[PDB]
Amino acid sequence: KVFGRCELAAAMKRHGLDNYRGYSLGNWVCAAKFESNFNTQATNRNTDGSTDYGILQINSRWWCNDGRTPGSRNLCNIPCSALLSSDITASVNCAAKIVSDGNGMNAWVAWRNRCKGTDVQAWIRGCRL
């Protein structure tokens, strides 16, 4: 599923990302935009045999298990396929755990490069959420 910007903002808000561990909702919408263009089925294969999955491009080497990634830690204790659903539940649960590490949202390079420090709230303005 490819989410509309405001549609995702409302869903992420329902899923608790608005002001989660100090991060305003704008950060997550902006991050989703740069990571997958709001596409839940986005996948990206890496050189190390790992794959990024979903709307927030979560890695199979550390966060989820796809049953065929070497060095799998499965920190979110979830099959990667759960991160490709039209239902964002699993991706948010995992993101909420990833961001609970000291590195916070710096876990998402696209966020650091394209969102960190900007007027992230711009991403949710205009939205009736």
Partner: antibody, heavy 113, light 108 residues
Framework: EVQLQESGPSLVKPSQTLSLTCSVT????????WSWIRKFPGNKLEYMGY???????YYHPSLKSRISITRDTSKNQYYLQLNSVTTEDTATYYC???????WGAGTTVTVSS | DIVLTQSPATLSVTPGDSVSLSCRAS??????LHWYQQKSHESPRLLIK???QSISGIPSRFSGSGSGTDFTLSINSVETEDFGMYFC?????????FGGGTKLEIKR
């Protein structure tokens, strides 16, 4: 198949250090974020802190300064250190996964001279 | 620090009765509220995560609802093995905090 177990001195003297070990079995200590939660008399639960995958820790501000959470990847255990204890630190201590899906049986530590 | 207030402090019911336990937050915590059960001489058990999400392996009679500052843990016809303490815990902001708990006891 992940199981946790707390172990350590059951008695600590006022002003001394409380040390507990949490042994992780079934999975690696690097396969999750790990926490320490204690329960005071009167059903009062306190989330003491946790250590995440990067080694970074988060400590409860009310404790902050007296507490340290560390891990040993070779023994697959993580630990709790609480300095300068007082009678008010008497409680049941539990180690648990950050996800809350696995908890140790808990161990009582009493502070008394 | 976020304060969680649970009510009632205690409630006595007959097995088969259905109940609703309240947990209120001093600040909005969105859906970042979890429910635990702790029976006598046992460790806490996670029943519902993120306000309303089911956990595989937990009896279907347990369900959660709410958002923001108002949450409810519901039990469809309480069973003989459900008596004990129930606590809510928030993970929206550090430090994580627990409610004071509600004790579910047997009515006679």
């Amino acid at each position: 198949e992940v199981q946790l177990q707390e172990s350590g001195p059951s008695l600590v003297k006022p002003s001394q250090t409380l040390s507990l070990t949490c042994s992780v079995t079934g999975d690696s200590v690097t396969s999750d974020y790990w926490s320490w939660i204690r329960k005071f008399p009167g059903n009062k639960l306190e989330y003491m802190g946790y250590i995440s995958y990067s080694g970074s820790t988060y400590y409860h501000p009310s404790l902050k300064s007296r507490i340290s959470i560390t891990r040993d990847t070779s023994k697959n255990q993580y630990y709790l250190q609480l300095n300068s204890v007082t009678t008010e630190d008497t409680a049941t201590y539990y180690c648990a996964s950050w996800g809350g899906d696995v908890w140790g049986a808990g161990t009582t530590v009493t502070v008394s001279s | 620090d976020i304060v969680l207030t649970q009510s009632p402090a205690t409630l006595s019911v007959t097995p088969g009765d259905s109940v609703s336990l309240s947990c209120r937050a001093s600040q909005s915590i969105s859906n970042n509220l979890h429910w635990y059960q702790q029976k006598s001489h046992e460790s806490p058990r996670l029943l519902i995560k993120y306000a309303s999400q089911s956990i595989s392996g937990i009896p279907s009679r347990f369900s959660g609802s709410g958002s923001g500052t108002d949450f409810t843990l519901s039990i469809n016809s309480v069973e003989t093995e459900d008596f004990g303490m129930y606590f809510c815990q928030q993970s929206n902001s550090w430090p994580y905090t627990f409610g004071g708990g509600t004790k579910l006891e047997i009515k006679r």
